[PDB]
Amino acid sequence: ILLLRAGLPSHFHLQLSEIEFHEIIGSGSFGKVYKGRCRNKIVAIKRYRCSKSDVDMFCREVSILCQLNHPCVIQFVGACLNDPSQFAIVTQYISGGSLFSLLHEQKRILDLQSKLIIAVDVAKGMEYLHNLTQPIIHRDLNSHNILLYEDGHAVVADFGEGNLRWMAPEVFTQCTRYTIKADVFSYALCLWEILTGEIPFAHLKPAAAAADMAYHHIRPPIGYSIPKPISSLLIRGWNACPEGRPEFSEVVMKLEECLCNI
Ligand SMILES: CNC(=O)c1cc(Oc2ccc(NC(=O)Nc3cccc(C(F)(F)F)c3)cc2)ccn1
Question: Which domain holds residue 11?
């Protein structure tokens, strides 16, 4: 736990007094999320409620955050590490809100170019996460975990919320580590959500949607209106065979090629 304190770079250490708290932004099992001011920046402070389960998770997040340096991934400001009562995580505050709010709450209509910029930014950030010397599976990529600047660029974050031959496929899957290709499945649903401005399987509650995708092989409808290079990314992206899904390098390259024509 203090192993983190030694391992963390100097400028990232923060004192609890150096952090000004203004409003609450969200709640979790980890604690509350504040909007505040710290180091002359408007920041977001992830504050924690000191028993083993939650602490192992605290070090994990900090360990992840001091490694991230990319314009399409959330920025770490630093963390407070004096006592467990004062454990906190400080990041940039991206003021434009979540992609979810933009699409489903504010219900805004977007330009195709507007849509493609967000998509590419998410793709760029994920390629970044997947090309770390120790690659990171996001595991929870969705429109709530994608934040937007006021200028419409976006940032990828995480709110912290036998013999095989006769085995059942749902039993086989629990013996198989999921890989980064799991993030490609998730991205593709988000990309469909951007293009259509619709929540995936909007008519269903989440667990029903998940089983329809897994057990009954339903995907969202790919209309004909959807651009040739994109719709291809979708089909392959949400393929049931993980290996059959593209790398982000390809998504980025193809989505960027589209920007040049819009
Ligand atoms: C209107 N703006 C906001 O309400 C708002 C809220 C806001 O809260 C947050 C605070 C901290 C985090 N911490 C985070 O992503 N940690 C992380 C952990 C593992 C992996 C990743 C990765 F990036 F790799 F996915 C990230 C997120 C959100 C931030 C900005 N703005």
Answer: 1-95
